[PDB]
Amino acid sequence: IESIENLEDLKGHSVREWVSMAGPRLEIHHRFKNFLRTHVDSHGHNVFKERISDMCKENRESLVVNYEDLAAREHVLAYFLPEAPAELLQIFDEAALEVVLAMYPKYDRITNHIHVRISHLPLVEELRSLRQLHLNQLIRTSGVVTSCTGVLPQLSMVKYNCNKCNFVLGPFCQSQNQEVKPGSCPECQSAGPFEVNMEETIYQNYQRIRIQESPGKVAAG
Amino acid sequence: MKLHCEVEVISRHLPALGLRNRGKGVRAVLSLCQVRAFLLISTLKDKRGTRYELRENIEQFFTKFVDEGKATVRLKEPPVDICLSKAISSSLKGFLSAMRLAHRGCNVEFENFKTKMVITSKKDYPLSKNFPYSLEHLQTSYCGLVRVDMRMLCLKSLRKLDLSHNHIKKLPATIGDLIHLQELNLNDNHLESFSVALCHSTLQKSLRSLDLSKNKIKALPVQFCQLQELKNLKLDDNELIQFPCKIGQLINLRFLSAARNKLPFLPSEFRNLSLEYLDLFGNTFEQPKVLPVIKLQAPLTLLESSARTILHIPFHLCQDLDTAKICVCGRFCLNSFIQGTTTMNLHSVAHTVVLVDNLGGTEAPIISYFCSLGCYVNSSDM
Amino acid sequence: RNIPKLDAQRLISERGLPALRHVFDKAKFKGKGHEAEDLKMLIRHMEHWAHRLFPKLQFEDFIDRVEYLGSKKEVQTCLKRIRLDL
Amino acid sequence: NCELLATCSALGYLEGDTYHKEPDCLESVKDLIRYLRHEDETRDVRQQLGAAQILQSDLLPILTQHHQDKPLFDAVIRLMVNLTQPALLCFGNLPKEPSFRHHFLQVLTYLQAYKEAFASEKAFGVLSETLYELLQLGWEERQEEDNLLIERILLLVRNILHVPADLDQEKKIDDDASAHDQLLWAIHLSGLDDLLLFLASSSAEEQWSLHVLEIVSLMFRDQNPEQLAGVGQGRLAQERSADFAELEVLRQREMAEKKTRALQRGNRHSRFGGSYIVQGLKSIGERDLIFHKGLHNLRNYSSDLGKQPKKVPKRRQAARELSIQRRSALNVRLFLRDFCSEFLENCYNRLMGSVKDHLLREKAQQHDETYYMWALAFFMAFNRAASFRPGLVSETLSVRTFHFIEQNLTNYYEMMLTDRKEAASWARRMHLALKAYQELLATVNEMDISPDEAVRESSRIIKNNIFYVMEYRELFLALFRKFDERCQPRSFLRDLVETTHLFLKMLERFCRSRGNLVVQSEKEFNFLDYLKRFACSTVVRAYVLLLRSYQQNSAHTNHCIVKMLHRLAHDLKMEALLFQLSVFCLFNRLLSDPAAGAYKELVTFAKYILGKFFALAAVNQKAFVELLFWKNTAVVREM
Amino acid sequence: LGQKLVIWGTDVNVAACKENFQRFLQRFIDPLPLYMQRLGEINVIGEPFLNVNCEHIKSFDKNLYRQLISYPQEVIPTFDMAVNEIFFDRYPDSILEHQIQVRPFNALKTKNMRNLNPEDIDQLITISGM
DNA sequence: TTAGAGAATTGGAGAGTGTGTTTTTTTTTTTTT
DNA sequence: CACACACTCTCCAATTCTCTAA
Ligand SMILES: [Zn+2]
């Protein structure tokens, strides 16, 4: 894959498919790795060396990136980030894992994924002002948390025992949209009462919160 | 090259998207055509079948059940998945080898006939020799067949053979050469008896429904009990004066109809039945509680025939099994000849009973054995 | 079951043309200057006859089928017979 | 996919409005051409480059901003011709199975996208400028280097004009600029239209006559000659007032139909019960009919009130017209009128002579005579429209063109009947031939009307020749006796009927004016025994089939139908041929029409034949049975 | 053809019922030509309905009243046809949004809610209530 | 030139499979009692 | 559980295509 000297020329694509295809994906990956490795603050201190070191000291599995720093240092990543946030956040997580395992080669024992979190995004929105124009875009809102579920286990990559034979169905990704139905067993074609393999299934923490407008920002009555 | 089989094509988005497939295949033919190789899948829906590219783009195969039991290939591709639910193993293996070669790439009518046919009368259509060879099901009715013919006997795959309302006087022994026969009906024919040697034929393991109603049979053979696969048995409107004494061996039996026959009393092993449905209406069972008991004299032969049934080809041993007298009565066994009769409630053996007679009429007499307390109870009843 | 057909032999010469000969014995046309209502009466009678013959079809579908049936042996033989005597 | 992405990236990038080409554009473009040449039969590289939109993003900017770099320009032109290759050429045919049809639709989608992109005037300006500075040189000065470039330029223009309109965006309303209209406007502003006129009029560059003919055909694809010839300065007020008036007419028709339906149903809700016995009407059994659909329906009772219509099986489904007509943009219509006028005055005779020479020499593709016949129809119709001058089309007025069109029409007729797997395509080719024949037959009438005794003389000569030779007379009967609604559209049936009406008009007037008895080894002739050949059941069956759409037919078409049927009835005494039950149902609709006053001729003819029928029926009741079938000589037995 | 119609299982001729209601409209005058005044009021006001008193129908023709009460689902549409035929035989170019509805009514209740029975099904009744 | 006998394709009857269902009381809390 | 709806598949035979004689 040749390095792409200009990510900015979409050449008629939209941002989502443009960053989904391999060339721009690798270019974004390398640009984010270089950003993490070489970004320095106003005093010349490498901020992300310190941040990754603190994260690995405390086993926290998550890396907060300042959007102001990203926009200042690497423009096109900040350009594509709010347009295709899921795709670029996946790529950023991969790149951050590469940098983290460069710094701490044994951190795979503690984690298998690094979550890149974005802070100080200028795209601030009021809850009353969210429209269909903001769909599938990275927004920033404010409010008071009024409800919280308990921390619940959710399927992320689920495996199913076949209802008759001993085969196990392949990894199916959970989507947040609907229940994943296994289909039919490829060994024998049965499609009966399948059951989750708890030991081979990968779970993730889930918590659904309800936020509302803060009572001092809502109008009286 | 071509393969005939049931096919099911599953687009692989469906499971993760939460959508469930049909769950069974559709009869089809697969063709490996080729300047560059294609797979053509054609069904009843499309003689002009769908192509699929396979030059470089087979994902993987599944082969755990290529022996063609609960089977498939589950051939995955970008993006579809192709399942082959029933074929023949050798041709399917050759087809899979050709598919693998085509994917390596560097080198190189679903006609059918139904299970079923019917003749409502010979003068409308005779059976002739135009039947399908592997026919599964046929009805013949109101035809003048005095005896069953090779025309239906030679059929290689019959599940159902029906001759009801024909004029059969006798039926053969070679009707039992039908391996998969599960339904045999001769309702309203002229049968004098069921075929004796037919009991130990393929029907011994295969027959699940037998109908001999409206025939002048006076008695079934004692080796009729060999038909232990049988679930449904219909014998009403006949001259039948007794069941076979070893009817208790018909452990698969669930439905029994023998209404308006000549039965005086039931066999002793009738207690071993576990029917769902029993019909014996108007059979003229005997009323009295008289005690005409057969006495033993305690001979060694009777004692041996009684006792050896509990520890059992030899024809004498088979006859002794038939004359076991229910293992020489259920208690205080002496010999297999101490025979009498008592009264039985038919809900002991069937959860649905047709009221055989009036005035309650839920009971009938049954052969019994009277060692000690049984004889005492019989004396009390008399 | 006996799924019916509007064919040349079931009904077209049995409940069809022989009855159509009799349908207009009691008709009530009034001639020149009244062609519109005469045609309305004619169409109603023809439609009623066609319905009682084959009730599965609409009237124009019945017409488009029977015009094809006009080429068949039984139909034209019955037509010539009706032209001649009975 | 990724290797194509790499080369597409290597082409360069756009910045604002300026394209910065990489130095390796030449080898990357050659690699793209190599991939396209080594395509799969599914045309995967075609689909992938269309998805990447490099034609819109790279090649058009390179073509428009680096046209001085001649090797790159030539390579880009060849690549663009390859990419704009029409889908029917890409796949050979319309695929019969879903996968190849999906690939066909993908390539067609990207072709439509290319056509959308190509409306920029800059691209056609560069193409016109390079073609102009090439054609500035003498023909003898050209070599393969320049002749092949002319071929590729004209093929690029042909490919871009050929593209079908997207089914999604063909819903444009009239008087709006479709993608084709914008493309024609781009050609107009670039001045490539004048270059096409030069190429058509040039004697030296006659080698490109077939190409230029195809360009002009695809340019005038959507237009109608008389409608186009009527365009002028004062059209905006006319069309505005016409639109308002037509809106009101449509509204009044809908209001009338709504009132009739409101009367047909009652003023009570549908679950308001009530049942009646109609004592006289026997049911399908012997019992009296029980009616449940309300008393209001028994005024116009029919037994098919509640019946589902029938599925016409696939084989019997009638052919439908392939496109609706829309009034294109007024600027484009004015430009096309001016193009057609100047082309007719300056180019048409030489171009048609050149194309006929090409067809004679047999250095043309398989069906280029279809373009020839199209050009005959369109430009002779445009000539007769507005200022008719036969000198502008005198190359076409020869009897040899009549012979050529008749031969082509008979050939297409035979091939339609035999090559059944593209019978509709052969029918369309035959339709083009029929329209060309119709325009010749109309042009001789216009020559008769015109004042010049010379053109009147030659009109008499060609009329004598055509009416003498037998095939011109027999072809109409041949077409009627094997026309099929299943295969040929109602537009074809309209054109056939109108051409037959015009032909019989001319022949009748000719024979009425003078005897001219010998015809076809000659034999005698008269028009009455010729008309008796139109007394067959099949031809009148076709005529009433066209009559069924009298509501939608043009007034001239209705006049043609009713005049032919009046000729067969009143003048040949063949009313029993037209005594039919289906025809009587059509007459019932005609008499029941609320707009029956607008069809005074049709209803009067219908009442004439109905009165004759009811006279015969009063005399003899077997006429009711005779209504039920089509007939042969029972037309005389009934009499 | 309307003259062949009879109400189902009723032996009442729809055409005869229509004619009887037409002569009722034409000739009843004495509530103290009555209903032609109501037709003119409809003509000038533009309201498509006609109120008619069942007692007037009864006093004019007992049999017509019995038919109306017993078989309203057919008789009331028959009265609609009658009144519209009269109204558009007169006033030939007046335009109405809908055909006129005849609205027969009894001045007082014929039955009460407690005494309604299955014998009264598909029968015209008048009841008082809140 | 019409139409009728044999072969192939399409319409739809029906056999088989899968899904969904049948005012009351005790306690708190803020405001008003 | 079990009795109605809802949906798919298969087979059967009725219609239309092709080739021949009246
Ligand atoms: Zn399995």
Curated annotation (Swiss-Prot), chain A:
Task: According to the UniProt record, list the residues that bear N6-acetyllysine.
Answer: 49
Show the coiled coil region(s): none
Chain positions with Phosphoserine modification: 214
Disulphide bonds annotated for this chain are none
Q: Where are the zinc fingers (C4-type)?
A: 162-188
Q: Where in the cell does this protein reside?
A: Nucleus; Chromosome
Origin superkingdom:
Eukaryota
Glycyl lysine isopeptide (Lys-Gly) (interchain with G-Cter in SUMO2) crosslink site(s): 11
What happens to this protein after translation, modification-wise?
Phosphorylation by the CDC7-DBF4 complex during G1/S phase is required for the initiation of DNA replication.
- What is stated as this protein's family in its record? Belongs to the MCM family.
**What is its quaternary makeup?**
Component of the MCM2-7 complex. The complex forms a toroidal hexameric ring with the proposed subunit order MCM2-MCM6-MCM4-MCM7-MCM3-MCM5. Component of the CMG helicase complex, a hexameric ring of related MCM2-7 subunits stabilized by CDC45 and the tetrameric GINS complex. Interacts with DBF4. Interacts with KAT7. May interact with MCM10. Component of the replisome complex composed of at least DONSON, MCM2, MCM7, PCNA and TICRR. Forms a co-chaperone complex with DNAJC9 and histone H3.3-H4 heterodimers.
Misc. remarks from the entry = Early fractionation of eukaryotic MCM proteins yielded a variety of dimeric, trimeric and tetrameric complexes with unclear biological significance. Specifically a MCM467 subcomplex is shown to have in vitro helicase activity which is inhibited by the MCM2 subunit. The MCM2-7 hexamer is the proposed physiological active complex.
- Can you say what this protein is called? DNA replication licensing factor MCM2
Please give the organism: Homo sapiens (Human)
Curated annotation (Swiss-Prot), chain B:
- Cite the repeat ranges for LRR: 134-155, 157-178, 180-201, 206-227, 229-250, 252-273, 274-295
Chief subcellular location? nucleus
Cellular component terms per the entry's GO annotation: cytosol; nucleus
Q: Quick one: which pathway?
A: Protein modification; protein ubiquitination
Tissue specificity comment: Ubiquitous. Maximal expression was seen in the heart and skeletal muscle and minimal expression seen in the kidney.
Give the UniProt subcellular location, in the record's own words: Nucleus
Record keywords: Leucine-rich repeat, Nucleus, Repeat, Ubl conjugation pathway
Q: Name one GO biological process term.
A: intracellular signal transduction
Q: Write down the SMART domains for this protein, in alphabetical order.
A: LRR_TYP
Q: What does this protein do?
A: Substrate recognition subunit of an ECS (Elongin BC-CUL2/5-SOCS-box protein) E3 ubiquitin-protein ligase complex which mediates the ubiquitination and subsequent proteasomal degradation of target proteins. ECS(LRR1) ubiquitinates MCM7 and promotes CMG replisome disassembly by VCP and chromatin extraction during S-phase. May negatively regulate the 4-1BB-mediated signaling cascades which result in the activation of NK-kappaB and JNK1.
On assembly, the entry states:
Component of the probable ECS(LRR1) E3 ubiquitin-protein ligase complex which contains CUL2, RBX1, Elongin BC complex and LRR1. Interacts with CUL2, RBX1, ELOB and ELOC.
**What is the name listed in the Swiss-Prot or TrEMBL entry for this protein?**
Leucine-rich repeat protein 1
Source species of the chain: Homo sapiens (Human)
Gene name as annotated? LRR1
From Swiss-Prot, chain C:
Q: Member of which family?
A: Belongs to the CSM3 family.
Per the entry, what this protein does is: Plays an important role in the control of DNA replication and the maintenance of replication fork stability. Important for cell survival after DNA damage or replication stress. May be specifically required for the ATR-CHEK1 pathway in the replication checkpoint induced by hydroxyurea or ultraviolet light. Forms a complex with TIMELESS and this complex regulates DNA replication processes under both normal and stress conditions, stabilizes replication forks and influences both CHEK1 phosphorylation and the intra-S phase checkpoint in response to genotoxic stress.
Show the segment(s) annotated as Interaction with TIMELESS. 6-82
Where it sits in the cell: the answer is:
Cytoplasm; Nucleus
Organism field: Homo sapiens (Human)
This protein's encoding gene: TIPIN
Q: What is this protein called?
A: TIMELESS-interacting protein
Domain of life, per lineage: Eukaryota
Quaternary arrangement and interactors, per the entry? Interacts with TIMELESS (via N-terminus), which impairs TIMELESS self-association. Associates with the MCM2-7 complex. Interacts with RPA2, PRDX2.
UniProtKB/Swiss-Prot annotation, chain D:
Q: Where in this protein does the record put region Required for homodimerization and for interaction with CRY1 and CHEK1?
A: 1-303
tRNA-binding is among the record's keywords: no
Q: Which positions carry Phosphoserine?
A: 275
Q: Which GO biological process annotations does it have?
A: branching morphogenesis of an epithelial tube; cell cycle phase transition; cell division; cellular response to bleomycin; cellular response to cisplatin; cellular response to hydroxyurea; circadian rhythm; detection of abiotic stimulus
Question: Which keywords has UniProt assigned to this entry?
Answer: Biological rhythms, Cell cycle, Cell division, Chromosome, Developmental protein, Disease variant, DNA damage, DNA repair, Mitosis, Nucleus, Phosphoprotein, Transcription, Transcription regulation
Q: Where in the cell is it found?
A: Nucleus; Chromosome
- Quote the cellular component terms of the Gene Ontology held in the record: chromatin; nucleoplasm; nucleus; replication fork protection complex; site of double-strand break
* Induction and repression of expression: Regulated by the cell cycle. High levels in S, G(2) and M phases, with highest level in S phase. Low expression in G(0) and G(1) phases.
Q: Name one GO molecular function term.
A: DNA binding
Cysteine pairings via disulfide bonds: none
Q: How does it assemble?
A: Monomer. Homodimer or homomultimer. Component of the circadian core oscillator, which includes the CRY proteins, CLOCK or NPAS2, ARTNL/BMAL1 or ARTNL2/BMAL2, CSKN1D and/or CSNK1E, TIMELESS, and the PER proteins. Interacts with PER2. The interaction with PER2 is direct and via its second PAS domain. Interacts directly with PER1 and PER3. Interacts with CRY2, CHEK1, ATR and ATRIP. Interacts with CRY1. Interacts with CLSPN; the interaction is required for leading-strand replication. Interacts (via N-terminus) with TIPIN.
Write down the species: Homo sapiens
